[PDB]
Design a protein around this ligand. Structure first.
Ligand SMILES: C[C@@H]1O[C@@H](O)[C@@H](O)[C@H](O)[C@@H]1O
Ligand SMILES: C[C@@H]1O[C@@H](O)[C@@H](O)[C@H](O)[C@@H]1O
Ligand SMILES: C[C@@H]1O[C@@H](O)[C@@H](O)[C@H](O)[C@@H]1O
Ligand SMILES: C[C@@H]1O[C@@H](O)[C@@H](O)[C@H](O)[C@@H]1O
Lengths: 414, 414, 407, 409
């Protein structure tokens, strides 16, 4: 029964973010966990620092691509489990980009590029670290090292959109000293969104009062947890990757369809969450061609969906038996999100979408002036039963040559 | 009881072809049927000839891309329903590429490029034509025009891999004079494969003795028809497009997953058919970026599957209850094609593929020396019951960093 | 093309009861036992000596048909095993007159049907395992088959129909159907002829279909004779009784299949296998009582209702049936209504739509309890949307039927 | 992770029980919740006591039917939400069978019948009660009334197999004084099984938790260092527990068999429910299900009682599973077809390899329980793989869940 604090309300309006995984692992192109899962010799793996040139990393291109896909923030891996830092740690560690041939603070380039495009920069930081022996040998000292690495991020790069922490699940029973860590963040970055990824086995959990967002990794839940009754509201976020891996994986051919990606983005909004779509950069920091294809396709959809994608919120309006349709609410309009439509041919050439296609909703109590598809402005016919709050629209199929996967009709009230 | 003629045997070894739709419709990017389905003014639509530059058509790059994806032939639209010819009709018509600014016989460039890459060139020819008034006003004269247009293709381009006719379904009861049309083809191109697409309502029918291949458009059948029992054997072919349209359609976002494309290719081989994977070129003749992504991903799979994709054939060996696995036979080996595998993590991090995974097959009666995955040469453990012809393998999951969608194990016999 | 009167009458029957009873019934391991279990023929045929029919009461069978809402009964007069349940008058010694029963069972059956206003139909297997003629002299077999049918055509008065089964065993043979059906037409001009095998002869009235045929059935060519259709269901996996077949379908599935038949424009036969001595088993009685509650409720539409070009909205299994005065919405996948405290699933407003109704509606009500439903129409697009309320607590009809009353 | 108490171990060996719903509601045949859900006038509904004759209740027939179906206990509704008691409450209430024309202690008849058949009598008791005003108007006094009603059951009927409490879910936040209620039960009936249908372990004295029918995974047996608790699932034949004449939505007999097998697989007991008629008879429809289930449980007798879940999984895409006794393993195999022949193809004809992972011991022989046919098999002992040719049913039979006994070397 609490409502979101302004910065959280601002976060929910972001809607869609791009997740970016890039580290030393990227050179191998066999997934970001390669060092542990393939049981590599650490010394040999860590030699990858010597060929980390970042020769194709262009933060401007990345920010441009995020803008074009309709993303409003980017979460970049500043340090993954491998423990290599993509920024200047100022003497905290020698395992950082300043000790690689790249010799560029990549996080500085990233934040400048985000600002030029009006995107919020978010920093992913692994809390489970494979590089520093402090992790197992002196946990209290490890917490200090982690906190210092975050402190550098809080003080050297201007205002930060958010932090995305990951790895506390590796030591479920430890005292991670979150009030000190989060408190430090609140001191230097009062407006930052704090996310703690509590991992696959503990979905929806709030690990500290300072947490703003709970995560659902890889897969969508049925409902988003918004925090205990009477406590601070926390937002939710789902994250998906295009194939089975987060870092680039050259021989992972198991990509989701573009259509499924569109349905997952719409679905997140339906259940009241943001969604992160992940891409893994190449070894040298380029967006791979495959990811570019997905971004172009999703980008066509998000441009069409712009009136509702950001401000639209769940509302107690359900769809009729046997359909996957749903409704989103802004302060001026309702929007019918309609799935499973077909292309329209003509009476001679039948594509599937030709016949009258009544789609009903329960929970709309106000007389409607008009309804129209966002993609082409066609006006739909509809009937209402105001007492039972029933709306029925004839959801016409796609014009030949197009197929939006999730089609959106805007409702204009009297 | 008949066996395939040599040319048809050669056809079945092709396995995979690339279908290419390119015409005036391409400039509009709203599907190849746009002229009819969107009720365009014919005069105005046909003005698209004036901006047909083919400025980005490079037959060499196209043939190279076909070779890299593992295709062994290409079917190119020489004339679609719109009735515009991509070749020099030598006085038959003014509605051809020689009267467009391109001024290049595109079919000549195509055939030369195919030959350099050892690909068979196939010519798609629409028999239902929206351009010539002969079609409705004087059908007998239309048949003469169609036959002459095919005759030009038969005499001016060297040996032709095949012809892919489409549109007889528009007049199911007409006499199309197939003996004369196919007799002419047999005269000039005795070795050509003749395919007649009998359309969605008439799957797998033989419209003349000269037909070599029956088609199944868009969708896969349960069984491939090989002709009436004592008659000429005919091969089968399934055709699929990446989204919902054959020509390019910019706002059709409803793409199939790469994984489904891989499964459909494997499936086609399982049931004893070739498969055509379709791309629509841009207005100026380029392979679009999205199609390139699919070709790169499918290309990794077909390179791995090369030992079996071409020579492999269906064999009476079935898989155990509840699996989608199947077997292909070459003269030296059997190959287990195994679906629904997961990635292998480790003891600590579980991804799904870790446990022993017994997959059984019924119909293998010969003792086996060894079994190994094509992708990494790992040796699989197995047991046999020779009397009941049971084989059981432990189908290990993918090494982290990879996912082949359909994984293939080669059997080596004693 | 218009159905002949007898075929129009047939389609109004709607539901029939199929009865399988033969020597196989004594073994209670399915009607194909002789062939599938590779039994010694001589030994199997000895079952004639214990065929007493001690518990066969044709009146109880006719009563069970009436209670289930069936309008005809198809009885196995001779199955593949080749034993005749009637007096063949010298054609064969392998008939009920040579068994201890010593009763013409078909005569008792026809009298019982008549008393209950039901049509008697005779199943006759054309694939026969008894007579050596079948393999050793096919032309003479056809004569024997025809004679056995002739006895049925001439000794019992007017018959409802004949249900032939087995031509599929020899798909390429000449069965001499014009002679066989011509003989039937001579003695029994009004009888329905069904062939369980596509139309194999002009005299066929009804073809059989697979119970899961999705689409409305084939009625023959535009200028040809109209042929009706029929689907069949058995309660478990076997037609004759099978004591250790526990794989019974749900009553709900049986109800759905009966409704589905009407939706695609077919009759439906529900099968029971009698015990060795001719009794209806207790399990079959349970199904009859449950289906019988449904068919009594559905009576306004079950007989006269016909398919009509009105489709249901996306993701629904709902369908419409038409009589001359009314349309009926047949609505599936409803839930029971509890309250605010006790949620059973059927509580919320439940809009179910249909496309193809162009006339203004006065009133719509459920057949089971007369509750009036609210609805809206778009007459131009022919859309109807009803609030299909869920079942009153304590009931669940599986297929619920709403009658439409027009203005 | 501790070992079950003797009484609980004995409970798990019961395997299958019959649930029986019978009360005043039965006379209306529109479900057991009719009084509340149909918003009936309380005074008028409660008049049903005057026609409660029990004229067709025969506890002996009920116990016989339970025995024949292979059930080892019966849970009878002694008082449902309607609040009418099927036993002599000895002055606690006038709304009991002694004030109805029946004038017979039905629970006494029930316990005697169970004993003659070697079945454990269990008493269902609704804790959510619609009759007494105490329930809403004076909850502390209600708890006393409930406890007294249970006390009568604990002192007047000899040793009681168990109690099956239902209704605490109506007031999830209330203090139900379970230490006192269960403490009283422990005093008079130390060996009784206590089940609380929570709609979680609500008190240390609970022996059995109830679970959903469709629970996929092996059940929760209590926190790691604490008392082991058993599990139980329930199924009814249609949508209602009391009789409901116009509820035609019956499950298939096949689904009932699969649910019984499934309960064993997850390590639970299962209750199959029947609702008696107004006058206390088993309806004909219920009899059909019991005859069918009975055929299956008689065949499954070697494993149904003593069989327990074990870490042996089935191959990809099958629903097969394994149960373990001290002498044998049993393969429970689903989705088989009938065997015809080459000419008449019924589906079960081909070799049908079904695999399991987790068996590490060499096997001597495997055979179907229904007909003793010996199955062929191969093993890979290092990877613990077993593959059997699971032959289809002989024509004329179909067991739904077929069971193969494994005999070890
Ligand atoms: C988003 C994912 O979440 C974590 O749990 C990591 O282990 C993965 O590598 C990835 O970063
Ligand atoms: C392969 C497809 O087949 C035909 O039927 C054409 O009408 C389509 O446009 C396309 O070329
Ligand atoms: C109705 C069924 O149909 C036939 O084909 C027979 O072979 C069956 O035994 C049964 O009579
Ligand atoms: C077994 C069922 O369990 C309870 O929750 C009751 O409310 C039902 O009526 C029935 O007794």
């Amino acid at each position: 029964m609490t409502e979101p604090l302004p910065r959280i309300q601002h976060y929910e309006d972001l809607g869609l973010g791009l997740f970016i995984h890039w580290g030393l692992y990227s050179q191998m192109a066999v997934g970001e966990w390669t060092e542990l899962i393939h049981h590599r010799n650490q010394h040999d793996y860590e030699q990858l620092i010597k060929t980390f040139t970042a020769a194709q990393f262009d933060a401007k291109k990345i920010a441009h691509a995020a803008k074009a896909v309709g993303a409003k923030y980017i979460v970049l891996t500043t340090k993954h489990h491998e423990g290599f830092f993509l920024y200047d740690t100022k003497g905290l560690s020698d395992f950082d980009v300043m000790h690689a041939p790249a010799r560029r603070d990549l996080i500085a380039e990233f934040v400048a590029a985000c600002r030029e495009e009006d995107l919020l920069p978010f920093f992913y930081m692994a809390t489970y670290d494979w590089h520093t022996p402090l992790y197992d040998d002196d946990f209290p000292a490890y917490l200090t090292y982690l906190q210092k690495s975050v402190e550098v991020l809080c003080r050297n790069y201007g205002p930060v959109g958010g932090f995305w922490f990951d790895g506390n699940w590796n030591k479920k029973d430890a005292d991670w000293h979150l009030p000190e860590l989060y408190g430090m963040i609140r001191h230097y970055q009062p407006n930052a969104i704090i996310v703690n990824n509590t991992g696959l086995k503990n979905r929806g959990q709030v690990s500290d009062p300072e947490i703003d967002v709970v995560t659902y990794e890889r897969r969508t839940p049925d409902e988003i947890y918004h925090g205990a009754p009477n406590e601070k509201y926390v937002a939710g976020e789902i994250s998906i990757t295009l194939n089975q891996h987060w870092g680039i994986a050259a021989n992972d051919l198991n990509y989701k369809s573009p259509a499924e990606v569109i349905e997952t983005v719409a679905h997140a909004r339906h259940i009241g969450a943001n969604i992160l779509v992940n891409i893994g950069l190449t070894g040298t920091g380029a967006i791979p061609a495959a990811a570019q294809t997905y971004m172009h396709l999703l980008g066509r959809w998000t441009a069409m969906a712009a009136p509702v994608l950001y401000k639209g919120r769940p509302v107690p309006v359900t769809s009729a038996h046997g359909t996957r349709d749903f409704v989103l609410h802004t302060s001026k309009h309702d929007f019918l999100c309609i799935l499973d439509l077909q292309v329209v041919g003509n009476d001679n050439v039948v594509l599937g979408g030709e016949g009258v296609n009544p789609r009903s909703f329960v929970g709309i109590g106000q007389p409607i002036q008009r309804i129209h598809w966002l993609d082409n402005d066609e006006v739909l016919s509809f009937t209402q039963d105001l007492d039972k709050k029933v709306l029925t629209v004839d959801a016409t199929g796609y014009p030949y040559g197009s197929d939006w996967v999730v089609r959106i009709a805007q409702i204009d009230y009297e």
